[PDB]
């Protein structure tokens, strides 16, 4: 993962239970961005028709 | 459970007697199990599997 | 009838034992309980105000 | 008017045996061939398991051959192959049948637990199977002959008996024989004979086993069934679409195992039909018949004979019985759940910007959800040409459809739900607010109700389609409509974590800060002072406030003054509405007071003000919590400086006990205890060290040297406010953590010295591991346990629902504070409030009615009772409610999500079970008065001794402390032989000595005075000589009657009190003299001739818990070592002991017939051997059996036993549950009662208290003057009580399906519904709540003209 | 939007019959038989019916009476029509 | 919303018609159970009007 600057303090209830408040910087820097690769298959079968 | 001979107790819960119990169990890596167990009358018994 | 209190295993309970005498109720209880490996604790006569 | 023919909305149901003709009725054709499809062009082969002719067309409105393909052709049967042209849906409907060659027993009726055929015929099962298998012949209607009827024969025997009498005797074998038996049987005549027999022999067993069978018989007669039908002639075949042949990708097919089974049955049956025409030998045809029976049996219920395996697959094929039963324990269709349209789910999150009535709903989600509504709303305004166009519009996501969605979203609520639903709050309705994202936004204040964290929990959404569902969601399931717990009236909307820390940091006060001492005109300029950085949040300040009060009648009174408060509190006051006094926010406002604020706000202003108040509180809470800048550092946790010393000393302590063990001064087992005790004692020192070094530690100054107050340390603020953390938890961070225990269960004598702040070496962690593992496992298991308990509880209650309004009974229970141990483990105002009085209670001065008759007691009423000193209020309860088949509102109570009295039609049993089951996951020697009051002796007989003291001669004795007010504070029990320095009506102070005694001694004292004689005490027999070697003062020890000699074992040793003349001093006020016998192992005090007085002891005799406890309670389980009670009031006696046990002969002073019981003597006694004891007295101590309470004490006693015990369990864990729910569980428990007398129903029959009472009360008038019969209330466990239900459809759910269906079938049970579960199964409106009106109306239309 | 139905619940005590009556009224409006008795704020028939309950200008009694009167409207208009059916004799 | 084969469609049409109601029926489940039970010698029928 990625280490980052963290501050412990209630922010307007947005951190309420376990919840996390993330700066727009982190999403802008594209650092926590993840790449996924999906395999999508198409089958050509044989029917009586 | 490693194949070999294993001697157990099974004490307390059997027949309330407090006389406990004693049993030997021969477990191979393949094939039938050979069991020898006691009982409240102090008679020796044997069961295959 | 007579309620015989039998206790064994992890817990206890009462079972009806029919008979013409408290002593007879005890004998019929034990004969019909003890040999199975069940302990006979108590024997009570059935009251029931009528 | 013509009654009816075709299908209207149906009433109830009926289940029974099916005639062969009744079977052929459903059948639209016979399946004569095992074939399924054509194998090439796949089509139903005519007369096969799949057929268009027999069942239905393969395509909608089209013939099989293809002649008539038009939707016009309907009632026409094709000429080539007769197939009526109709929707293919009828292939899910049409039944079929099979004509069997030879009769076949129905396995359900043959193999059922009672074996219905067997007990109908009074014929043993073994013999029946012996006949069916052609093992032996059985006579039928033997007539006048050498042999009886049910009598069985063998080959040779039957041959010989046949050689004797050809005619006038009849015997057969096989299924045809059982069929003949059943058909020939005359129910009537047999009944008559049984009635004649029942009246002759008088014996318990005989007449019981007789009356049971005759009952069953006449029941079978009235049923409408017939014995013949127990043997199958025709075999019905299930519709093909319920056992589909449907194809799959790759060309492979898939079908039900019912096809395999049915195919086998058809095949073997056909083979039998062929063998009969081939005139095969007996040895063959018999085998074929047995094979047919086996096949049919395997079809109906598989696993009761051979467990047949399906083709090419080892796994046993699933039969029709397995089709009905299903799986996963006991679940049949809609119980275990089902898939639902218009629904979704997702990860959940914050959103505190929300209001208590709303929740964030993802745009895409809301779109896909309300998609059908969007379609119509689009073409409604004309924005879309047609429905297709609308679909394309929302599929293209044109910018208009968003604004068009906002319309449908506005007033249309949505249902939010979580995974572990327990209490009804698990599903709550909110108002949708469109949100950009894939996450569902939830209101923080609801997080407590859902028990949902933000750690990746998911919630599901449901759409209330029908208008009624919308209004139900809005007026019932709405978030703002439930602000309260169903378990107790306390607010569930109470602020949780950050918010409470915020309000805490606000209403806190500091010794010196900005603006200290200054004055402010009001809250406005206070907040103006703080927001400008001028005055500090927490500072001591006098401000002018205007607080109101509603104290005028229906009217708000305004008052204004100068309150001494803090700036923060003053700022907070801007929120609190109207009538609430300023004293509510003047405190520090922990998680507790902040809740009572909301509570009082609800009980004063109303619902709306409470809601808006709550929202505001959450907002300001989060706000100032954010402003507070509260954090947690490593330096926030302060380790005691003295800790290192506390260890050393303790580390020295063990060493002491380490040396003494080596010198033999202390034993091993004693050493272990000493070490564990000192090591455990050190932890308390370190812990209560760090606490003091934490809480007040901050030392500050104001215009001077030093002043100390409560600490502003962050972690401590969290722990104290109630935000999170606690003493036990902070203890682990700073001070040493606990003493762990090995898996053996025994505690290790080397506790963990280091803490979390400090490092942890390998060992300590490795030792902590077991604790962790066992913790996780334990919780994970207790989840399942709680779930199961909840299930059993819902099962036992269910259909119990408020039906009547007011039953009008003065009956109820006596409500007093619990008064446990030292002081008041629960107050009166709790157990009272919300519960309407049974009868008018009075002031200490009488002829004054403060609370008239029956009136719901609310906050003001309870406050009025609190003004006065009243310690008791009689309260109507659900258990005492006279309403039959339900509960009246005036009994149950008020409590609900609303403060008003319980509504009519609400289902109380369900919410009761839920309220009991939800919190259940959290579950696992002298009297000294603590307060000042006046001594009151309750239920005691005593005497004054020669020392001037007061000795208690009664076993059951109570000591109550009644202060000047007249209220009971302290309550204790005083043992026999206790010495009181006081008397009744005396005066004591705090900590003053009242009672004193010894535990190991049961002193036998004397009421009267005089010399001590000796009777029936003989040395070597009854007694024995023993003299102390350290003193020389002796006593002759009474030898127990087990260990005595030959003839001395028959004598009862005694101490009889004699006067100067040598007479016998009698028990005061009676003809009966005084002689006190002594028991075994009882050492005397003074010998013969020595004079004593009162109070002098004649002889001195030596001597689970948690959730499963609740389970045992509700199940009314008898404990292992039950306390024996005196069955009949009288003077106890010891007869000659017998057989390892001891006789106990009770002696009634009143009538007669002295009762004797067998008590094992090893059990230590309680009762005085020579004294009287009332019924219900303790002959020995230990746990009490619930049945014993119900029988020897009574209903009101046993219900109190249950409620007090279970509440003792829950309250110990800090869990609030109103007694109501438990009381309804009790009501369901004792529902059954066994009749004693007669004149209407049977003698010993167990029957419903409601039923019985509704009968006898009807028999007290008209009828006979009174022929009414007496009964006895019976205590049933919740599972056993749940076992009893009138509806067989409901019983088919949780019970065993097979047995229930069979027993119901033979009886011809008519299920009238009327219950919840059964109506849910059949998919119609619940007979409660919203639907209660409907089902009421119909219920009135029924049974009327 | 109606946040709390408490006021409505005050009128007809119940709270089950509140749902029934308000549903009935919401039916009278939604599928049009008629217009409402209270100015619409752009509240749906649910909230409108609930408002009408709050103002006390609608309930079970009033509804039953009104419907019974509408039956009289339709039995009035149809008089000659159905009385022309004397052919039945 | 689930088990009613007619109920679903007959609903959806009203949902788009602007009419919020329901015209319920017997869930296909319980009906299937009626057939399954009646497939045995057990006769289960609905009565009255
Ligand atoms: Mg969680
Ligand atoms: Zn055809
Ligand atoms: Zn009542």
């Amino acid at each position: 993962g990625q280490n980052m600057r963290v501050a412990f303090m209630p922010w307007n209830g947005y951190n309420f239970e376990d919840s996390i408040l993330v700066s727009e910087r982190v999403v802008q820097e594209d650092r926590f961005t993840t790449i996924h690769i999906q395999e999508l298959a198409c089958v050509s079968r044989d029917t009586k028709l | 459970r490693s194949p070999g001979v294993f001697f157990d107790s099974d004490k307390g819960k059997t027949h309330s007697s407090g006389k406990v119990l004693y049993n030997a169990r021969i477990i191979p890596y393949r094939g039938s199990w050979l069991d020898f167990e006691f009982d409240p009358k102090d008679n020796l018994f044997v069961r295959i599997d | 009838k007579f309620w015989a209190t039998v206790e064994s295993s992890e817990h206890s309970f009462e079972v009806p034992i029919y008979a013409e005498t408290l002593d007879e109720a005890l004998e019929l209880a034990e004969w019909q309980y003890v040999p199975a490996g069940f302990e006979v604790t108590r024997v009570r006569p059935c009251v029931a105000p009528k | 008017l013509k009654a009816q023919t075709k299908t209207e909305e149906f009433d109830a149901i009926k289940i029974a045996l099916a005639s062969p003709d009744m079977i052929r009725s459903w059948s639209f054709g016979e399946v004569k061939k095992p074939e399924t499809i054509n194998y090439r062009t796949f089509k139903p082969e005519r007369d096969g398991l799949f057929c268009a002719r027999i069942f239905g067309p393969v395509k909608d409105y089209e013939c099989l051959c293809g002649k008539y393909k038009r939707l016009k052709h309907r009632g026409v049967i094709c000429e080539k192959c007769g197939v009526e042209v109709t929707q293919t849906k009828v292939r899910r409907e049409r039944m079929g049948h099979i004509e069997l060659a030879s009769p076949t027993a129905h396995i359900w009726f043959l193999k059922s637990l009672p074996s219905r055929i067997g007990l109908l015929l009074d014929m043993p099962l073994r013999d029946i199977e012996r006949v069916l298998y052609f093992e032996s012949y059985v006579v039928i209607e033997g007539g006048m002959t050498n042999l009886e009827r049910q009598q069985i024969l063998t080959e040779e025997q039957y041959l010989d008996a046949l050689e004797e009498f050809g005619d006038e005797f009849d015997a057969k074998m096989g299924a045809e024989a059982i069929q003949a038996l059943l058909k020939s049987m005359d129910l009537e005549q047999e009944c008559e004979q049984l009635r004649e027999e029942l009246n002759e022999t008088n014996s318990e067993t005989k007449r019981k086993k007789l009356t049971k069978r005759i009952k069953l018989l006449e029941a079978f007669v009235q049923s409408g069934n017939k014995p013949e039908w127990m043997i199958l002639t025709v075999l019905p075949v299930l519709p093909p679409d319920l056992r589909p042949l449907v194809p799959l990708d790759g060309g492979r097919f898939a079908t039900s195992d019912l096809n395999d089974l049915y195919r086998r049955v058809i095949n073997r049956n056909n083979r039998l039909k062929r063998l009969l025409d081939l005139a095969a030998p007996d040895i063959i045809v018999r085998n074929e018949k047995r094979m047919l029976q086996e096949a049919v049996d395997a079809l109906l219920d598989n696993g009761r004979r051979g467990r047949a395996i399906t083709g090419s697959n080892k796994r046993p094929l699933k039969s029709l019985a397995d089709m009905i039963k299903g799986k996963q324990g006991r679940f049949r269709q809609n119980l275990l759940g089902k898939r639902v349209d218009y629904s979704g789910r997702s990860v959940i999150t914050v959103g505190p910007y929300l209001r208590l009535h709303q929740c964030g709903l993802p745009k895409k989600m809301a779109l896909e959800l309300f998609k059908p509504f969007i379609y119509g709303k689009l073409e409604l305004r004309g924005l879309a040409t047609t429905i297709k166009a609308a679909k394309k519009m929302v599929e293209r996501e044109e910018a208009v459809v968003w604004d068009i969605l906002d319309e449908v979203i506005r007033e249309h609520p949505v249902l939010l739900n979580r995974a572990p639903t327990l209490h009804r709050l698990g599903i709550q309705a909110f108002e949708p607010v469109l949100i950009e994202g894939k996450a569902i936004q939830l209101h923080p204040l609801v997080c407590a109700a859902y028990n949902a964290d933000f750690d990746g929990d998911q919630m599901a959404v449901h759409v209330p389609l029908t208008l009624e569902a919308q209004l139900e969601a809005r007026a019932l399931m709405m978030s703002t409509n439930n602000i309260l717990s169903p378990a107790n009236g306390e607010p569930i909307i109470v602020p949780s974590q950050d918010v409470v820390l915020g309000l805490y940091y606000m209403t806190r006060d500091c010794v010196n800060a900005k603006g200290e001492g200054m004055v402010l005109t009001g809250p406005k300029e206070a907040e103006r002072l703080y927001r400008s950085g001028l005055a500090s949040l927490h500072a001591r300040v006098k401000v002018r406030i205007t607080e109101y009060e509603k104290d005028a009648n229906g009217e708000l009174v305004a008052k204004t003054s100068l309150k001494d408060t803090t700036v923060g509190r003053a700022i907070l006051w801007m929120i609190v509405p109207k009538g609430l006094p300023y004293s509510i926010v003047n405190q520090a406002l922990g998680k507790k007071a902040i809740s009572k604020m909301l509570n009082t706000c609800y009980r004063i202003l109303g619902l709306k003000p409470t809601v808006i108040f709550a929202d505001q509180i959450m907002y300001t809470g989060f706000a100032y919590a954010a402003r507070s800048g509260a954090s947690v550092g490593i330096d926030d946790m302060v380790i005691p400086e003295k800790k290192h010393e506390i260890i050393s000393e303790a580390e020295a302590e063990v060493a002491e006990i380490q040396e003494q063990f080596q010198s033999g001064l202390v034993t091993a087992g004693e050493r272990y205890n000493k070490v564990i005790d000192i090591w455990a004692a050190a932890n308390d020192r370190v812990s209560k060290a760090m606490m003091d070094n934490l809480q007040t530690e901050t030392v500050i100054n104001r215009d001077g040297q030093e002043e100390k107050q409560v600490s502003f340390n962050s972690i401590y603020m969290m722990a104290d406010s109630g935000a999170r953390g606690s003493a036990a938890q902070i203890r682990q961070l700073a001070g040493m953590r606990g003493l762990m225990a090995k898996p053996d269960g025994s505690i290790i004598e080397t506790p963990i010295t280091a803490n979390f702040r400090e490092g942890l070496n390998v060992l300590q962690y490795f030792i902590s591991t077991h604790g962790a593992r066992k913790g996780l496992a334990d919780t994970a298991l207790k989840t399942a346990n709680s779930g199961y308990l909840t299930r059993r509880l819902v099962d036992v209650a269910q259909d119990l629902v408020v039906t009547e309004d007011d039953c009008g009974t003065h009956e109820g229970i006596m409500m007093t504070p619990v008064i446990e141990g030292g002081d008041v483990k629960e107050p009166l105002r709790d157990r009272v409030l919300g519960r309407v009085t049974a009868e008018d209670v009075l002031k200490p001065g009488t002829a004054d009615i403060l609370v008239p008759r029956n009136t719901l007691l609310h906050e003001q009423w309870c406050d009025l009772l609190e003004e006065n000193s009243v310690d008791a209020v009689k309260v109507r309860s659900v258990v005492s409610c006279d309403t039959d088949f339900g509960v009246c509102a005036h009994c149950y109570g008020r409590d609900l999500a609303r403060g008003h009295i319980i509504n009519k039609g609400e289902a109380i049993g369900v919410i009761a079970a839920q309220s009991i089951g939800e919190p259940g996951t959290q579950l696992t020697s002298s009297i000294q008065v603590k307060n000042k009051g006046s001594i009151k002796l309750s239920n005691v007989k005593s005497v004054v001794n020669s020392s001037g003291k007061l000795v208690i001669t009664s076993r059951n004795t109570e000591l109550k402390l009644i202060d000047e007010f007249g209220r009971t504070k302290e309550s204790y029990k005083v043992p026999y032989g206790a010495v009181l320095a006081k008397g009744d009506g005396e005066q004591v102070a705090g900590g003053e000595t009242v009672a004193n005694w010894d535990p190991h001694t049961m002193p036998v004292i004397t009421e009267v005075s005089g010399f001590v004689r000796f009777t029936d005490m003989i040395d070597g027999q009854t007694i024995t000589r023993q003299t102390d070697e350290l003193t020389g003062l002796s006593s002759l020890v009474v030898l127990d009657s087990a260990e005595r000699t030959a003839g001395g074992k028959d004598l009862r040793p005694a101490l009889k009190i004699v006067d100067a003349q040598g007479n016998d001093v009698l028990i005061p006020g009676t003809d009966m003299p005084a002689q006190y016998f002594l028991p075994g192992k009882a050492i005397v005090q003074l010998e013969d001739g020595v004079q004593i007085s009162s109070g002098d002891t004649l002889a001195r005799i030596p001597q689970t818990g948690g959730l499963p406890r609740v389970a045992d309670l509700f199940e009314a389980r008898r404990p292992k070592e039950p306390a024996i009670l005196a069955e009949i009031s009288g003077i106890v006696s010891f007869g000659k002991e017998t057989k390892g046990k001891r006789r106990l002969v009770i002696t009634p002073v009143d009538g007669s017939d002295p009762y004797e019981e067998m008590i094992p003597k090893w059990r230590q006694l309680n009762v005085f051997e020579g004294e009287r004891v009332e019924r219900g007295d303790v002959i020995s101590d230990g746990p009490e059996a619930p049945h014993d309470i119900l029988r020897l004490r009574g209903v009101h006693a046993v219900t109190r036993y249950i409620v007090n015990e279970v509440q003792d369990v829950y309250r110990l864990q800090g869990v609030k549950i109103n007694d109501k729910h438990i009381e309804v569980i009790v009501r369901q428990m004792l529902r059954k009662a066994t009749i004693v007398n007669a004149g209407s129903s049977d003698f010993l029959e167990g029957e419903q208290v409601e039923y019985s009472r509704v009968k006898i009360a009807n028999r007290e008038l008209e009828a006979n003057g009174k022929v009414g019969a007496t009964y006895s209330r019976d205590l049933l466990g919740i599972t056993k009580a749940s076992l009893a239900t009138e509806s067989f459809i409901s019983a088919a759910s949780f019970q065993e399906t097979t047995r229930v269906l069979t027993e119901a079938a033979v009886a011809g049970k008519r299920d009238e519904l009327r219950g919840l579960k059964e109506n849910v199964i059949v998919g119609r409106l619940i007979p409660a709540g919203t639907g209660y009106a409907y089902h009421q109306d119909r219920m009135r239309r029924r049974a009327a003209g | 939007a109606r946040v709390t139905v408490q006021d409505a619940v005050e009128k007809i005590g119940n709270r089950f019959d509140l749902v029934l009556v308000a549903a009935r009224r919401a039916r009278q409006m939604q599928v049009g038989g008629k217009d409402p008795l209270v100015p619409e704020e752009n509240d749906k028939t649910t909230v409108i019916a609930l408002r009408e309950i709050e103002e006390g200008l609608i309930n079970n009694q009033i509804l039953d009476v009104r419907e019974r009167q509408e039956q009289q409207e339709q039995e009035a208009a149809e008089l000659q029509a159905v009385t022309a059916i004397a052919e039945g004799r | 919303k689930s088990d009613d084969v007619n109920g679903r469609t007959k609903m959806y049409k009203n949902i788009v018609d602007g009419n919020h109601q329901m015209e319920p029926g017997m869930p296909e489940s319980f009906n299937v159970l009626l057939k399954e039970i009646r497939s045995l010698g057990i006769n289960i029928e609905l009565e009255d009007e």
Side-chain angles (χ1 to χ4, degrees), chain D residues 418 451-455 457:
Chain D
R418 202 193 130 87
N451 194 35
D453 291 273
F454 285 156
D455 54 39
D457 301 85

Side-chain angles (χ1 to χ4, degrees), chain D residues 806-809 876-877 880-883 887-888 890-892:
Chain D
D806 195 336
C807 63
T809 180
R876 308 173 67 170
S877 178
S880 61
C881 192
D882 198 45
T883 294
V887 170
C888 72
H890 279 242
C891 269
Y892 180 83

Side-chain angles (χ1 to χ4, degrees), chain D residues 137 153-165 169:
Chain D
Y137 283 94
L153 306 173
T154 193
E155 280 259 305
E156 279 190 330
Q157 289 164 355
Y158 178 48
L159 174 60
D160 199 87
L162 238 182
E163 279 185 342
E164 258 208 292
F165 347 90
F169 143 77

Side-chain angles (χ1 to χ4, degrees), chain D residues 46 63-68 77-83:
Chain D
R46 60 189 300 102
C63 170
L64 187 271
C65 74
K67 187 163 184 179
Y68 313 85
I77 45 179
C78 180
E79 296 83 35
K80 272 80 173 185
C81 49
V83 177

Side-chain angles (χ1 to χ4, degrees), chain D residues 357 407-412 431 467-468 470-472 474-476 480-482 607-608 896 898 900 903-906 1329-1330 1333, chain E residues 1-7 9-10 13-20 22-23 26-27 30 41-47 49-50:
Chain D
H357 59 261
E407 288 194 31
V408 251
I409 255 55
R410 273 188 54 90
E411 312 286 62
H412 194 332
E431 202 164 63
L467 225 45
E468 283 88 341
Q470 308 193 106
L471 290 126
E472 276 175 353
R474 178 169 286 275
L476 311 174
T480 50
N481 274 140
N482 315 322
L607 177 53
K608 314 131 290 297
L896 207 60
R898 42 185 281 183
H900 262 182
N903 320 291
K904 180 177 176 176
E906 189 110 50
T1330 284
Chain E
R2 169 51 53 212
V3 50
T4 47
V5 296
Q6 175 65 256
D7 293 334
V9 181
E10 292 289 308
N14 221 261
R15 186 212 212 179
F16 297 154
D17 275 281
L18 170 62
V19 182
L20 261 55
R27 288 273 235 278
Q30 177 188 71
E41 311 303 322
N42 283 328
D43 302 326
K44 293 197 185 65
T45 45
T46 302
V47 180
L50 282 179

Side-chain angles (χ1 to χ4, degrees), chain C residues 5 7 10 12-14 18 22-23 26 30 40-45 47 50, chain D residues 204 1118-1120 1122 1124-1125 1127 1139 1141 1143 1155-1160 1191 1236:
Chain C
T5 319
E7 316 190 356
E10 254 182 293
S12 66
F13 24 67
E14 291 168 343
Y18 291 81
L22 277 301
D23 232 28
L26 173 61
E30 300 185 2
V40 277
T41 288
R42 169 165 203 231
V43 178
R44 158 175 104 259
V47 53
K50 279 170 285 182
Chain D
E204 296 311 295
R1118 270 185 85 273
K1120 308 148 65 64
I1124 56 185
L1125 303 320
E1127 260 253 88
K1139 214 255 137 190
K1141 295 101 171 48
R1143 285 220 175 124
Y1155 293 135
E1156 41 189 289
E1157 308 165 346
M1158 240 66 158
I1159 308 170
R1191 181 168 45 100
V1236 179

Side-chain angles (χ1 to χ4, degrees), chain D residues 47-64:
Chain D
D47 305 26
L49 281 76
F50 301 79
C51 183
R53 170 187 178 275
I54 308 178
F55 310 99
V58 196
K59 247 197 63 178
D60 281 317
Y61 277 112
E62 190 181 29
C63 170
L64 187 271

Side-chain angles (χ1 to χ4, degrees), chain D residues 179-330 332-430:
Chain D
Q179 154 122 343
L181 261 173
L182 290 175
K183 185 150 56 183
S184 64
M185 159 177 294
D186 197 328
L187 305 165
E188 306 159 352
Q189 311 286 63
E190 248 215 59
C191 284
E192 296 184 11
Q193 286 187 331
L194 285 185
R195 298 184 189 287
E196 298 191 30
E197 289 191 3
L198 198 277
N199 196 77
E200 309 304 321
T201 69
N202 315 280
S203 301
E204 296 311 295
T205 53
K206 295 184 177 64
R207 281 184 289 99
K208 222 287 281 303
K209 207 156 70 68
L210 212 292
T211 193
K212 170 179 53 58
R213 185 177 183 272
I214 181 57
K215 259 295 182 180
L216 167 63
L217 254 171
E218 62 187 23
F220 193 92
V221 185
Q222 188 187 329
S223 171
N225 291 326
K226 287 191 178 304
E228 302 88 326
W229 302 332
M230 300 251 248
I231 302 299
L232 289 180
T233 306
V234 198
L235 207 169
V237 327
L238 175 84
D241 250 83
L242 302 183
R243 38 177 179 84
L245 235 171
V246 294
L248 271 315
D249 333 273
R252 282 201 310 183
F253 282 60
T255 125
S256 182
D257 306 14
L258 296 178
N259 288 329
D260 187 282
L261 283 162
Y262 267 105
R263 185 157 35 89
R264 174 173 305 121
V265 168
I266 299 176
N267 273 319
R268 297 189 179 183
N269 181 72
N270 280 336
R271 186 191 299 122
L272 208 166
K273 297 177 70 175
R274 201 152 83 258
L275 289 177
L276 294 193
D277 290 41
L278 265 57
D282 302 329
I283 302 92
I284 298 186
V285 299
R286 291 182 214 172
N287 187 33
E288 191 62 28
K289 289 185 178 185
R290 286 190 286 251
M291 288 165 58
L292 179 64
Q293 177 75 42
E294 185 191 51
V296 173
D297 290 340
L299 184 268
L300 307 173
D301 194 331
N302 198 38
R304 288 169 175 256
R305 319 283 253 180
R307 305 253 289 181
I309 66 179
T310 177
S312 184
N313 179 26
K314 169 196 173 182
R315 196 161 286 96
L317 26 67
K318 175 164 161 187
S319 62
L320 290 174
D322 298 321
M323 292 291 172
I324 307 177
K325 292 172 59 180
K327 222 45 198 172
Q328 201 136 25
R330 320 293 150 80
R332 194 183 52 170
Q333 215 32 250
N334 359 253
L335 262 194
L336 198 60
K338 190 159 59 178
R339 308 273 194 173
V340 176
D341 284 327
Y342 307 86
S343 64
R345 55 157 169 159
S346 187
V347 189
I348 63 173
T349 177
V350 218
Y353 67 91
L354 285 174
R355 300 253 291 273
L356 195 65
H357 59 261
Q358 41 187 292
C359 70
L361 219 173
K363 257 191 173 186
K364 309 180 182 182
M365 283 193 53
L367 210 171
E368 182 52 60
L369 283 165
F370 292 88
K371 202 181 197 183
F373 294 99
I374 307 175
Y375 285 176
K377 214 62 168 59
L378 271 182
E379 73 174 44
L380 175 59
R381 322 178 67 86
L383 272 58
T385 315
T386 189
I387 168 72
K388 275 280 188 174
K391 179 230 284 294
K392 285 187 170 182
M393 283 191 65
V394 318
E395 189 171 346
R396 203 193 329 274
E397 289 190 0
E398 303 187 13
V400 196
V401 311
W402 296 119
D403 278 21
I404 231 293
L405 182 148
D406 261 321
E407 288 194 31
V408 251
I409 255 55
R410 273 188 54 90
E411 312 286 62
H412 194 332
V414 286
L415 264 48
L416 265 60
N417 180 31
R418 202 193 130 87
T421 305
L422 271 301
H423 58 345
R424 53 189 240 175
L425 299 183
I427 304 179
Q428 257 168 112
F430 291 85

